[PDB]
């Protein structure tokens, strides 16, 4: 049975409607509320490599959607544009009335390719993909979502900035997935799990202002060597480097 | 049953967004043609962890998932909007779905003030037993 | 609060159309294959402005619009069918969502006929106080 | 909060479910009803020029639909087939299960072109477009609607003729909109706000029976000069004229 | 009104399939990614014709069709999921939609055990009438 | 009013919620249930010729769907792929979330052609086409259904094998409909109403193991002569024959 949150003795209890006592008063449907809470707030790793490993493709299971009325501002959201090698779309278009998650500090937009051995992409831990007040069991194409879960409550009677971070991916969904952070359409950085959003943005600004972008028709991929630090949860918390070149690979120290 | 948060971490503050089924609109702002776009219908707030409600709420949502997923597996509705309305109905059925036996444990009828309406006004008959 | 029609005009007669969740069908007419098309499921009627209900109804629909539009802005349902069912639920929750204190103003329990069942049958004990 | 109509002291009151007294009895969902009332009944101008100025295009606002159970016979309904100059449709096809308003004495079918600077066409005064027991915030293509509003009520315990009038329009939605009443595919009358439906139908019959239609491959546009009268609400209420010709314009007196 | 099966035949056994809004999932089986496909969510059972319920149920479904089809004709919902919830609401409105007159036929309030709480404790006043 | 089944005095009664007495207790929505019962269980003929005559095409009536929570294992289900002579589809694709009936011993898959003089195919006796926990008034293309009806109940407080049988049809929906049972893509048997599913399967096995299939590029149609028996309801209940040939027709005795 779907549990219900209720406040008793200055504490939140899990109860249900059939387990309340007569002193508990429900005088309006306004007292009943649904909330989406982000996995972020439980301490899960939010980097793109870690986050995408929590999702997988599966056939035979029809998608399901449930609404929720209130949500939590997210630091990390995700937006996927994945195709198969043959060019066909891996993810379905967002159904009518399903919009992106409304409050995202960083939108990790991942474009790329993978096998996608399944009709729909599900959350491997059973969580939901939270959109605009609608929670789905599956990922929709090009639609910003936060990973999260839904709670139901009985209440008692009585600026917004968003930054899009773009990635290229190969072998998406497998255990051999490669990620690149996109500086421009020809300059990229090899992505590692330890890179935080603010490190990527300052590494991006450094590459632009130090003039380390590609000045060729070809593709330039930087690698940040293990020397440099990057990383702790987001709610409780770069000037000059060296760049030399070595499909043109390179290294940054 | 109380909630034991067993997560690796807890963000003790809830920076939330939501809407409003009302909101005294300013002038013409309630008209869809003139009103805010989809991005501008939200209100924001900040809730702290008094009585441990925020960390308990994160655990509650976590523990709700299995029952919610199993419910969604069994329904043929593509989008489910009726969970809270059905629980409101089950609230009333639990308390009023059968005969209410007064003074019984499952009957939410208080005859307090009018236990004191008869036993006070018995002193209108035993009071006036004079001839 | 009463309704004050403040419209430029009022059509005092309501020539209405509606359907019927029942209607004793004639023979096979209830079968979709044999029954009326979409254009032929309607009944009609004419209602006049007795007690000013028609002109009041036109003003009521006018004044309902802001709250209805704001409700529709906040919902994610593409088509809303649950407004009246939710108000039926809120009716019951308002009257029976808590403990009903008899003789209180918010408790719709009338002990009238059985105030007169005890005070009548006290004259079975004070009546028979003989030995 | 969505208000509720209730009958008290031989009069309609606006109340709500939380404001009723114990004598008020709601013993069945059959007592709860929703009604659509037409703006017509409030005295608004119903001519095509006046009516279309109450509608406008807007992007960023998702459409919304609410059902209503009973409606009012309409004297004027509207049916729009508007395209952009490049030929693309301005209005979306009617969603599944949304049919035209069921009782219309006159269906003003307007075909034509306009800029349509917005994804959907809304009612500028916040009213609804009433279809078959479904009220929408937006206009659907080629689907007959009446302008109206919805009321919700608690009740106490205890021939059809339709005529289609066809119009051509240019600059639809702007303040420079031109309308023509269609007699046949080559004979038209310059439309003015004062022309009532019955005047248009009798002007149409006069043009046919007086033989004033175009007998050319070209387009013939009549103008009714300010001399002649046409027009008062619809619920409380032409033999021989002169025709001389002057893209062929002409005048009628 | 009782059910008279008037069909040409009756299969007196009901080999049924259905789902389960719960079901203590084994390990990860509640997770959609790991759980059964659409074909594997069903449970089965066999019900026999004790008290004639199966043959009565077949006739009941038969006789329900006209009212159900007429209801579907009148609704604009493409898919109807709210029939049983609305009947739950109409249950409560029938019993609690008005004032409950105690001891009346339409009031489901039993003052039995506490008819015996006053008439027993009248022997605390007529008992102690001593000075 | 939609009737409700309730158990009283060791018997099922048709009642309603407004007709119950105070002793009747409804303490949970779990006590309210909907069931789909198959027409099979009432003794109707289930052969393809008899079953298809209960369905017909009709325009002007919008389709309607209602959900039901529990169903009955079916011995006979049907799956239609009907086109017009010009090749256009007679039946609409299954809407999103409408799957085939989940328990069918025999799925009679009928492919073929007919006039299909109507937008949707309805049940001529007012029954429903039962799918996966959704009952529809119309038939969807290539989607397995059982014919049945729905009941609503108030409860008191306290291996699967499936075989597909394939048919070809001409003149579907008329009173001049011809059916052929498909042995392979070139071997067929003229279908008659008396042929039970098990007779068709054993006639199929006999044709394969006796080597009576077509050994030509052409089409071979067998006819079972009135001599042989086939047929009683399904819940209360072939070795060697002669085959000689006579578009190649033939006879079996
Ligand atoms: C509610 O909250 C709880 C607690 O936070 C969450 O519990 C998590 O549940 C998931 C399972 O769904 C757990 O994930 C599993 O972790 C196992 C261990 O992971 C590592 O653990 C340590 C390092 O942390 C190492 O010693 C160990 O070797 C692992 O490196 C993995 O073994 C599992 O992976 C295997 O199984 C899965 C299927 O489950 C396969 O997909 C993999 O390929 C692999 O074979 C799995 O990843 C997770 O650890 C739990 N967290 C905690 C803190 O206990 C719930 O998920 C949450 N509910 C919802 C709905 O969000
Ligand atoms: C419920 O019922 C009430 C009363 O009937 C309706 O009230 C109407 O509300 C609308 C606003 O939504 C009013 O429309 C506005 O009218 C202003 C005045 O119009 C003329 O008034 C007189 C002639 O009648 C002249 O003196 C004057 O100069 C105007 O010619 C206009 O100024 C407004 O237009 C301007 O603002 C709008 C946005 O509102 C822009 O789109 C325009 O481009 C322009 O800049 C506007 O048109 C209307 O007058 C009210 N009627 C009455 C009788 O008071 C509610 O609409 C109704 N509710 C629903 C949901 O239907
Ligand atoms: C609930 O349960 C009852 C009882 O089982 C079902 O009742 C059936 O109702 C249908 C009508 O919908 C009946 O069908 C009609 O049968 C008539 C007689 O059929 C034959 O009867 C005998 C042989 O059995 C012969 O003497 C006779 O000549 C017929 O050969 C037919 O005349 C009807 O066909 C004509 O009308 C229909 C329209 O109804 C046209 O489509 C035809 O072209 C033709 O002109 C019709 O077929 C059926 O007989 C009833 N059965 C019983 C046992 O009484 C309900 O259907 C069921 N409800 C649901 C929803 O399933
Ligand atoms: C304005 N109300 C917000 C703020 C708090 C937030 C909330 C309300 C009550 C509780 Cl007990 C908690 Cl932990 C959190 C909430 C939840 C659902 C819907 C709306 C809201
Ligand atoms: C048959 N009932 C019709 C007629 C009157 C009309 C009606 C009913 C009650 C009121 Cl007080 C008013 Cl003003 C108007 C109505 C409204 C909603 C649904 C149906 C109906
Ligand atoms: C597990 N419950 C099943 C079995 C019996 C079956 C059932 C239940 C009660 C009755 Cl009186 C009947 Cl005749 C048949 C049913 C009906 C609806 C939903 C579920 C179920
Ligand atoms: C991971 O990929 C490796 C290739 O290095 C391969 O051996 C194996 O198929 C994968 N293992 C798992 C557990 O997925
Ligand atoms: C970068 O590439 C994307 C995708 O190919 C393209 O849409 C975009 O216009 C490009 N931007 C620039 C600045 O070249
Ligand atoms: C990277 O830096 C450039 C330089 O200002 C900026 O234009 C661009 O938006 C930055 N990229 C991101 C993802 O912030
Ligand atoms: C040319 O490109 C290199 C990267 O390949 C960059 O580091 C360098 O600064 C560019 N040239 C100049 C003059 O900036
Ligand atoms: C109306 O159109 C005129 C052109 O005559 C133009 O000046 C202006 O843009 C429009 N005015 C308004 C108020 O829309
Ligand atoms: C008039 O024009 C319309 C649209 O071009 C066309 O559909 C219709 O057939 C024409 N009618 C006649 C009589 O020419
Ligand atoms: C105009 O008159 C002709 C002549 O009878 C008629 O056929 C036509 O329908 C009329 N048009 C309208 C819109 O009534
Ligand atoms: C030819 O057309 C004119 C309109 O241009 C019309 O008035 C006239 O009657 C027509 N000719 C005849 C002989 O009717
Ligand atoms: C049946 O088809 C026959 C052809 O043999 C034809 O006479 C008639 O149109 C049809 N009869 C009925 C009752 O459908
Ligand atoms: C039989 O025909 C069907 C339809 O033409 C085709 O899909 C199937 O592959 C064929 N099978 C064989 C064994 O030829
Ligand atoms: C007919 O018999 C053959 C021979 O085994 C078998 O492969 C085929 O599936 C059978 N057809 C049916 C419909 O059972
Ligand atoms: C060749 O086909 C016929 C059917 O036309 C079949 O009866 C016969 O057995 C086949 N030939 C052999 C040698 O089996």
Q: Are F61 and F131 in contact (CB under 8 A)?
A: no
The total domain count for chain B is 2
Q: Are A52 and A110 in contact (CB under 8 A)?
A: yes
Q: Are F206 and F234 in contact (CB under 8 A)?
A: no
Give Cβ neighbours of residue C34 (< 8 Å, ≥ 6 apart): C28, F124
The number of C-alpha atoms within 13 Å of F88 and in the hemisphere containing its C-beta is 6
Of C22, C30, C38, the CB nearest to F60: C38
In this structure, the answer to whether residues B70 and B93 fall within a common structural domain is no
Domain assignment present for E32: yes
In this structure, the answer to whether residues B9 and B63 fall within a common structural domain is yes
Phi-psi region of E55 (alpha: psi -120 to 50; beta: other; left: phi over 0): alpha
Minimum CA–CA partner of D1 in chain A = A30
The bound ligand whose nearest atom lies closest to the alpha carbon of A185 is 8
Q: If you take atom 10 of ligand 7, which residue's CA is the nearest one?
A: A175
D124, B32: Cβ pair inside 8 Å?
Answer: no
Question: Which residues of chain B does A132 touch, with a Cβ-Cβ cutoff of 8 Å?
Answer: 38
Q: How many CB atoms lie within 10 A of CB E46?
A: 9
D window 37-66, beta carbon within 8 A of A: 62
- F250 burial type by CB count under 10 A (0-12 exposed, 13-18 middle, 19+ buried): middle
Cα B61 to Cα A128: distance, rounded to the nearest angstrom: 11
What does the block give as tokens for C129?
């106080």
Distance from CA of E25 to the nearest CA of F (A): 20
How many degrees, rounded to 5, is the angle at CA A110 between CA A109 and CA A112?
A: 150
Minimum CA–CA partner of F97 in chain A = A62
Mutate to test the pocket of ligand 18, among F213, F222, F240 (most ligand atoms within 8 A of CB): F213
Domain assignment present for C108: no
Cα B125 to Cα F222: distance, rounded to the nearest angstrom: 102
Domain assignment present for C92: no
Cα A210 to Cα A202: distance, rounded to the nearest angstrom: 12
Question: Which residues of chain C does D32 touch, with a Cβ-Cβ cutoff of 8 Å?
Answer: 84, 87-88
Cα D252 to Cα D249: distance, rounded to the nearest angstrom: 11
D60, B38: Cβ pair inside 8 Å?
Answer: yes
C37, F124: Cβ pair inside 8 Å?
Answer: no
* Residue in C77, C89, C102 to test binding to E, most E beta-carbons within 10 Å: C89
Q: If you take atom 14 of ligand 10, which residue's CA is the nearest one?
A: A211
Cα distances from E24 to residues B3, E27, E82, in angstroms, run 20, 9, 27
Q: Are E46 and E13 in contact (CB under 8 A)?
A: yes
Of C19, C38, C64, the CB nearest to D151: C64
Q: If you take atom 6 of ligand 11, which residue's CA is the nearest one?
A: D175
Resolution (A): 2.2
Q: Are F39 and F127 in contact (CB under 8 A)?
A: yes
F249 Cα: distance to centroid of ligand 18 (angstroms): 14
Question: Which residues of chain F does E72 touch, with a Cβ-Cβ cutoff of 8 Å?
Answer: 64, 66, 137
A62, F28: Cβ pair inside 8 Å?
Answer: no
Domain assignment present for E114: no
Q: At what angle do helices B83-96 and C83-96 cross, to 10 degrees?
A: 40
Asked if C97 is an interface residue toward chain A (Cβ–Cβ < 8 A), one would say yes
Asked if E78 is an interface residue toward chain F (Cβ–Cβ < 8 A), one would say yes
Helix (H) or strand (E) holding D233: none
D175 Cα: distance to centroid of ligand 12 (angstroms): 29
Give Cβ neighbours of residue F146 (< 8 Å, ≥ 6 apart): F36, F38, F39, F40, F71, F74, F76, F77, F78, F101, F104, F129, F130
In this structure, the answer to whether residues B14 and B48 fall within a common structural domain is yes
**C-beta of D208 in contact with ligand 13 (< 6 A):** yes
Cα F2 to Cα A251: distance, rounded to the nearest angstrom: 75
Question: Which residues' Cβ are closer than 6 Å to ligand 5?
Answer: C 16, 18, 45, 47, 53-54, 57; D 7, 33, 35, 69-70, 153, 155
Tell me which residue range forms the domain holding C25.
1-80
How many degrees, rounded to 5, is the angle at CA D65 between CA D59 and CA D68?
A: 150
Cα distances from E36 to residues B70, E29, E41, F175, in angstroms, run 11, 7, 6, 44
A118 Cα: distance to centroid of ligand 6 (angstroms): 36
Buried b or exposed e, range D49-71, using 16+ CB within 10 angstroms? bebbebbbbbeebbbbbbbbbbb
B99, F23: Cβ pair inside 8 Å?
Answer: yes
> What is the residue-wise DSSP string for A106-173?
EEEEEEEE----SSEEEETTS-EEE-SSEEESBPPTT--BEEEEEEEEE--------EEEEEEEESTT
Counting one residue from chain A and one from chain F, the pairs whose CB atoms sit within 8 A come to: 4
DSSP alpha helix (H) spans, D103-242: 197-209
Counting one residue from chain A and one from chain D, the pairs whose CB atoms sit within 8 A come to: 4
Index of the ligand 2 atom closest to the CA of residue D43: 5
Cα A248 to Cα D132: distance, rounded to the nearest angstrom: 64
Asked if A58 is an interface residue toward chain E (Cβ–Cβ < 8 A), one would say yes
In this structure, the answer to whether residues B99 and B119 fall within a common structural domain is yes
Cα distances from A124 to residues A129, A150, C46, D71, D224, in angstroms, run 11, 16, 61, 50, 73
Domain assignment present for E4: yes
Minimum CA–CA partner of B97 in chain E = E92
What does the block give as tokens for A47?
């980097």
Q: Which chains touch E (3 or more CB pairs under 8 A)?
A: A, B, C, D, F
- Domain final residue, candidates B57, B78, B99: B78
Domain assignment present for C110: no
- B37 burial type by CB count under 10 A (0-12 exposed, 13-18 middle, 19+ buried): exposed
Residues in chain D: 253
Q: Are E114 and B111 in contact (CB under 8 A)?
A: yes
Domain assignment present for C130: no
Distance from CA of C78 to the nearest CA of F (A): 16
B93, F23: Cβ pair inside 8 Å?
Answer: no
Question: Which residues of chain E does B117 touch, with a Cβ-Cβ cutoff of 8 Å?
Answer: none
Closest CA to F146 of F97, F57, F199, F75: F75
Closest CA to D36 of C88, A58, C62: C62
Closest CA to A188 of A209, A211, A207: A207
Question: Which residues of chain C does D66 touch, with a Cβ-Cβ cutoff of 8 Å?
Answer: 68, 72, 79-80, 83
D97, F62: Cβ pair inside 8 Å?
Answer: yes
**C-beta of D212 in contact with ligand 14 (< 6 A):** yes
B45 Cα: distance to centroid of ligand 4 (angstroms): 9
F124 Cα: distance to centroid of ligand 3 (angstroms): 9
Q: Are F189 and F183 in contact (CB under 8 A)?
A: yes
Closest CA to D202 of D248, D152, D252: D252
Domain assignment present for E118: no
D97, F18: Cβ pair inside 8 Å?
Answer: no
Cα D147 to Cα F116: distance, rounded to the nearest angstrom: 38
What does the block give as tokens for F246?
């006579």
Buried b or exposed e, range C93-128, using 16+ CB within 10 angstroms? bbbbbbbbbbeeeebbbbbeebbeebeeebeeeeee
Cα F177 to Cα F113: distance, rounded to the nearest angstrom: 10
Of A11, A33, A34, the CB nearest to B2: A11
Of F1, F64, F125, the CB nearest to C31: F125
Cα A236 to Cα D90: distance, rounded to the nearest angstrom: 51
């Amino acid at each position: 049975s779907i549990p219900l949150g209720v406040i008793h003795n200055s504490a939140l209890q899990v109860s249900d409607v059939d387990k309340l006592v007569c002193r508990d008063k429900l005088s309006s449907t306004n007292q009943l509320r649904s909330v989406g809470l982000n996995l972020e707030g439980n301490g899960v790793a939010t980097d793109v490599p870690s986050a995408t490993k929590r999702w997988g493709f599966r056939s035979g299971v029809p998608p399901k959607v449930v609404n929720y009325e209130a949500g939590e501002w997210a630091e990390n959201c995700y937006n996927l544009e994945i195709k198969k090698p043959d060019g066909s779309e891996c993810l379905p278009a967002a159904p009518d009335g399903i919009r992106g998650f409304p409050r995202c500090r960083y939108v990790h937009k991942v474009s790329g390719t993978g096998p996608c051995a399944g009709d729909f992409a599900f959350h491997k831990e059973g969580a939901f993909f939270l959109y605009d007040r609608l929670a789905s069991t599956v990922i929709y194409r090009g639609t910003t979502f936060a990973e999260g879960v839904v709670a139901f409550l009985i209440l008692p009677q009585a600026g917004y900035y968003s930054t899009t971070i773009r990635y290229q991916a190969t072998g998406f969904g497998t255990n051999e997935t490669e990620y690149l952070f996109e500086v421009d359409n020809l300059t990229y950085v090899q992505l590692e799990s330890r890179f935080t959003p603010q490190f990527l943005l300052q590494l991006n600004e450094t590459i632009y202002t130090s003039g380390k972008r590609s000045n060729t028709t070809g593709k330039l991929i930087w690698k940040v060597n293990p020397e440099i630090d990057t990383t702790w949860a987001f709610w409780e918390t770069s000037e000059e480097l060296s760049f030399t070149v070595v499909x043109x690979x390179x290294x940054x120290x | 049953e109380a909630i034991v948060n067993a997560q690796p971490k807890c963000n003790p503050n809830l920076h939330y967004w939501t809407t409003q089924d009302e909101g005294a609109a300013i002038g013409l702002a309630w008209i869809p043609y003139f009103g805010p776009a989809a991005e501008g219908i939200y209100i924001e707030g900040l809730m702290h962890n008094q009585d441990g409600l925020i960390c308990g709420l994160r655990q509650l949502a976590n523990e709700t998932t299995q029952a919610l997923q199993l419910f969604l597996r069994a329904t043929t509705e593509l989008r489910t909007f009726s969970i809270l309305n059905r629980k409101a109905i089950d609230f009333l059925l639990q308390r009023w779905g059968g005969t209410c036996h007064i003074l019984g444990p499952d009957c939410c009828i208080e005859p307090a003030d009018w236990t004191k309406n008869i036993t006070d006004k018995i002193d209108q008959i035993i009071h006036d037993f004079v001839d």
